[PDB]
């Protein structure tokens, strides 16, 4: 209603950044929740909370051994992807759970709230 109309685009000549996205190990991603969720054996050796502990894998975006960003567009198990931070809000607290780490929950653009173990922050962003 109030200043609530304003449009804006963004940019098509992105220079080089010093903090590309590492890649992600897809170990292990079911369909959850109505979402597919991923798991890796760094973040998840086995047992991720489909509830939210689960990657809703739609959030993130499988890039190729090379760290190629969205490649195939269709997230699939058993390789390696990268959680897109833009479709990401943030990273949230962690928590120790799934196996005994420590499981952060990020927050992701559909799968809201994305936990993951949060051992390593440069890890969602990383994949450390």
Not at 88 to 107: E, I, R, Y
């Amino acid at each position: 209603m109030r200043g609530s109309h304003h449009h804006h685009h963004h940019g098509s000549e992105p220079t080089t950044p010093t903090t590309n996205l590492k890649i992600y190990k897809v170990d292990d991603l079911q369909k959850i929740n109505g979402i597919w969720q991923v798991r890796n054996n760094i973040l998840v050796p086995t047992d991720f909370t489909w509830v939210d502990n689960g990657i809703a894998a739609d959030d993130v975006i499988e890039v190729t051994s090379n760290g190629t960003r969205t490649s195939d567009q269709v997230l699939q198990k058993g390789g390696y992807f990268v959680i897109n931070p833009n479709n990401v809000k943030s990273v949230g607290t962690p928590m120790k759970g799934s196996g005994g780490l420590s499981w952060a929950q990020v927050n992701f653009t559909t799968g809201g709230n994305v936990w993951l173990n949060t051992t390593s922050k440069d890890n969602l962003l990383y994949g450390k």
